Write a protein that binds this DNA or RNA. Structure first.
Ligand SMILES: Nc1nc2c(ncn2[C@H]2C[C@H](O)[C@@H](COP(=O)(O)OP(=O)(O)OP(=O)(O)O)O2)c(=O)[nH]1
Ligand SMILES: [Mn+2]
Ligand SMILES: [Mn+2]
Ligand SMILES: [Mn+2]
Length: 430
DNA sequence: ATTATGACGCT
DNA sequence: AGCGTCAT
């Protein structure tokens, strides 16, 4: 009743750039704009692997994780842009630099948590309080929410999509109590006004479009963001959760799309998020552990407490390359040459990071995969990272991995290596 | 040959 | 510390 917490304390947004790498290439090359187009890494094997897809191309069935030759079968007019290659490997610097452009704009409105190269969470609770005091109690005009959907509306008592969006927004605004500065629905609405302003600034100052979700926590904001892409934002209220979750497959909620979610489905014999409400907290903890059980008990009621961490910069700076099939590394000279290539890219990125961000990494993580192992990483070992020098880092990585060569010959490497990975970690202020 | 990154939990 | 999971 009056003591039952409802998880409505915060206003949280999730901003995700639409088909980011594609947009970066479309800004650079206007010939690619408003076209079916995709971004690929490499080219010789099956035309390269697609990693990002414009919405025009998605309409033909093109998807990430598809070979370009196969995508061209679905979409013969598909346009392609290739990721830059430096030192023999894909180099993602252009997209990291574009990401910094967007993150710095978002940080003007509120403190952000960089969740990926193209998405960030935003804690808007305080900004919403401020804008509400600036409002002095006037309602919010629909004109302030020109790209916002209200999930679950319209309802009850109409042929076009924009008209649907506007009907739902009108129903939502008509039911707002704008006199209560602590109304969670009002707070979410003001949050959506601010996110309209943030997205407008991003597009004005970079050319890039994005989608966003606004709700009371990170999981609901992420889920909301996906409901109406591209170039739109969605408000998911606390009240919208029972209907939304009643037909939501469990795998759609962030962290449940893998083995844990499959086990929730199998053990409990359910399909949808809302079905979780029928279990006690102790029942869920008994199946899925104390932490997961409490998280699921609260999540299926729309409640989640994970904070938006104040972190705009990545915690790690890494370099990795797969060597699939017959390109696996089988000699010592090969392994050394590629460790050097990775370490040279790492040195360049670390030196730029030190100048930009006033910090130094102190630990080097070396990971490899050996032929025949299904796991991503066959081995991870750390060593000290005391100087930003590529030859030193590559010799140190070789030292930590050389015991993995089971060949009796000094020159050959067996079993051959199908992955190398160098990662700089444990940053200290400098 | 579903690649190149990231974050975070477990023990 | 080293390994696994999840995202995409
Ligand atoms: N190198 C590499 N980059 C990836 C991979 N998967 C995604 N990316 C990059 C390219 C995407 O443009 C970018 C952001 O990913 P998202 O999942 O948010 O998708 P994207 O922004 O492409 O489309 P969206 O409109 O958000 O559905 O991350 C991958 O497997 N390898
Ligand atoms: Mn995106
Ligand atoms: Mn995507
Ligand atoms: Mn994203």
């Amino acid at each position: 009743g009056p003591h039952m917490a409802t998880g409505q304390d915060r206003v949280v947004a999730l901003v995700d750039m639409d088909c980011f790498f594609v947009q970066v290439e479309q800004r650079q090359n206007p010939h690619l704009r408003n076209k079916p187009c995709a971004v690929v890494q490499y080219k010789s094997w099956k035309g390269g692997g697609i990693i990002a897809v414009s919405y025009e191309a998605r309409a033909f069935g093109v998807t990430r994780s598809m070979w370009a030759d196969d995508a061209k079968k679905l979409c013969p007019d598909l346009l392609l842009a290739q990721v830059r290659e430096s030192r023999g490997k894909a180099n993602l610097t252009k997209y990291r630099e574009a990401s910094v452009e967007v993150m710095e704009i978002m940080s003007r409105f509120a403190v952000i948590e960089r969740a990926s190269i193209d998405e960030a969470y935003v804690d808007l609770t305080s900004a919403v309080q401020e804008r509400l005091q600036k409002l002095q109690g006037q309602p919010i005009s629909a004109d302030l929410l020109p790209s916002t959907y209200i999930e679950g509306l319209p309802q009850g008592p109409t042929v076009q999509k924009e008209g649907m969006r506007k009907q739902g927004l009108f129903q939502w605004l008509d039911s707002l109590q704008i006199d209560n500065l602590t109304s969670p629905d009002l707070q979410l609405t003001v949050g959506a006004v601010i996110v309209e302003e943030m997205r407008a600034a991003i597009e004005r100052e970079t050319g890039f479009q994005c989608s966003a979700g606004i709700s009371h926590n990170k999981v609901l904001a992420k889920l909301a963001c996906g409901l109406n892409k591209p170039n739109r934002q969605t408000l998911v209220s606390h009240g919208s959760v029972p209907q939304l979750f009643s037909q939501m497959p469990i795998r759609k909620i962030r962290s449940l799309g893998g083995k844990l979610g499959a086990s929730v489905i199998e053990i409990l014999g359910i399909e949808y998020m809302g079905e979780l409400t029928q279990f006690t907290e102790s029942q869920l903890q008994s199946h899925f552990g104390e932490k997961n059980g409490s998280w699921l008990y609260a999540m299926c009621r729309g409640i989640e407490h994970d904070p938006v961490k104040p972190r705009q910069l990545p915690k790690t700076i890494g370099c990795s390359k797969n060597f699939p099939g017959k390109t696996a590394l089988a000699t010592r000279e090969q392994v050394q040459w590629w460790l050097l290539q990775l370490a040279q890219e790492l040195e360049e990125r670390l030196t730029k990071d030190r100048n930009d961000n006033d910090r130094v990494a102190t630990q080097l993580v070396v990971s490899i995969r050996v032929q025949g192992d299904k796991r991503l990483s066959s081995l991870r070992r750390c060593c000290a990272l005391t100087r930003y020098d590529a030859h030193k880092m590559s010799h140190d990585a070789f030292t930590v991995i050389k015991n993995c060569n089971t060949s009796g010959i000094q020159t050959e490497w067996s079993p051959p290596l199908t992955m190398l990975f160098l990662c700089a970690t444990k940053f200290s202020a400098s």
